[PDB]
């Protein structure tokens, strides 16, 4: 004889179907993350890492590193050809 | 005049032994002395409801009932129906 109780029965009722499914996905995606640009890790110098933080950086990454690599390759090849040819 | 005594004795003799005093009937054969208080005693009784409304039967109707001390069973039934109604909201 008791009336229905919508706001009293919300323990099992969630927000539709998709919103409750994505609530767990969105609650923790924003929890454990850097606030703003933390840990840049820019500093690196290990020849390969020296190239990474010197010319191979993605801020520009223009053809200048490629031209420098080609210049070094042809400089080595000149001596190689002198040895061979 | 003559009528001044004749009609007064007319309306004081026959009505005297017709009603009020309630004894005998001289002017006409049918008597209303045992007709109006005895035969007509059930007159309105016949016209109205007898043994039901004239006696005002003390009909003791059944007292208002309730959920008959229903346990938590109806509580969780209400929970279930509310949940299935609110699931599609």
Curated annotation (Swiss-Prot), chain A:
The keyword Oxidoreductase does not apply. GO terms for biological process: proton motive force-driven ATP synthesis; proton transmembrane transport. It is found in: Mitochondrion; Mitochondrion inner membrane. The keyword Ion transport applies. Keywords: ATP synthesis, CF(0), Hydrogen ion transport, Ion transport, Membrane, Mitochondrion, Mitochondrion inner membrane, Transit peptide, Transport. Signal peptide: none annotated. F-type ATPases have 2 components, CF(1) - the catalytic core - and CF(0) - the membrane proton channel. In yeast, the dimeric form of ATP synthase consists of 17 polypeptides: alpha, beta, gamma, delta, epsilon, 4 (B), 5 (OSCP), 6 (A), 8, 9 (C), d, E (Tim11), f, g, h, i/j and k. Belongs to the ATPase F chain family. Mitochondrial membrane ATP synthase (F(1)F(0) ATP synthase or Complex V) produces ATP from ADP in the presence of a proton gradient across the membrane which is generated by electron transport complexes of the respiratory chain. F-type ATPases consist of two structural domains, F(1) - containing the extramembraneous catalytic core and F(0) - containing the membrane proton channel, linked together by a central stalk and a peripheral stalk. During catalysis, ATP synthesis in the catalytic domain of F(1) is coupled via a rotary mechanism of the central stalk subunits to proton translocation. This is ATP synthase subunit f, mitochondrial. It comes from Saccharomyces cerevisiae (strain ATCC 204508 / S288c) (Baker's yeast).
Curated annotation (Swiss-Prot), chain B:
It is found in: Mitochondrion; Mitochondrion inner membrane. It comes from Saccharomyces cerevisiae (strain ATCC 204508 / S288c). Present with 6140 molecules/cell in log phase SD medium. This is ATP synthase subunit H, mitochondrial. Belongs to the ATPase h subunit family. The gene is ATP14. Residues 54-89 are annotated as: Disordered. Keywords: ATP synthesis, CF(0), Hydrogen ion transport, Ion transport, Membrane, Mitochondrion, Mitochondrion inner membrane, Transit peptide, Transport. GO terms for cellular component: mitochondrial inner membrane; mitochondrion; proton-transporting ATP synthase complex. F-type ATPases have 2 components, CF(1) - the catalytic core - and CF(0) - the membrane proton channel. In yeast, the dimeric form of ATP synthase consists of 17 polypeptides: alpha, beta, gamma, delta, epsilon, 4 (B), 5 (OSCP), 6 (A), 8, 9 (C), d, E (Tim11), f, g, h, i/j and k. The chain holds residues 36 to 124 of 124 of the full protein. One of its GO terms (biological process) is proton transmembrane transport. Mitochondrial membrane ATP synthase (F(1)F(0) ATP synthase or Complex V) produces ATP from ADP in the presence of a proton gradient across the membrane which is generated by electron transport complexes of the respiratory chain. F-type ATPases consist of two structural domains, F(1) - containing the extramembraneous catalytic core and F(0) - containing the membrane proton channel, linked together by a central stalk and a peripheral stalk. During catalysis, ATP synthesis in the catalytic domain of F(1) is coupled via a rotary mechanism of the central stalk subunits to proton translocation. Its main location: mitochondrion.
């Amino acid at each position: 004889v008791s009336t229905l109780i919508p706001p009293k029965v919300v323990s099992s009722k969630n927000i539709g179907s998709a919103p409750n499914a994505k609530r767990i996905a969105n609650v923790v995606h924003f929890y454990k993350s850097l606030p703003q640009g933390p840990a840049p890790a820019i500093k690196a110098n290990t020849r390969l890492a020296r190239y990474k933080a010197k010319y191979f950086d993605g801020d520009n990454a223009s053809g200048k590193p490629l031209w420098h690599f080609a210049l070094g390759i042809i400089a080595f090849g000149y001596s190689m050809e002198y040895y061979f040819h | 005049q003559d009528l001044y005594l004749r009609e007064l004795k007319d309306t004081k003799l026959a009505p005297s032994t017709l009603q009020d005093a309630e004894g005998n009937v001289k002017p006409w054969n049918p008597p209303q002395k045992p007709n109006l208080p005895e035969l007509e005693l059930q007159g309105p009784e016949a016209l109205k409801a007898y043994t039901e409304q004239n006696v005002e039967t003390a009909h003791v109707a059944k007292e208002s009932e309730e959920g008959e001390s229903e346990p938590i069973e109806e509580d969780w039934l209400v929970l279930d129906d509310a949940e299935e109604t609110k699931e599609s909201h």
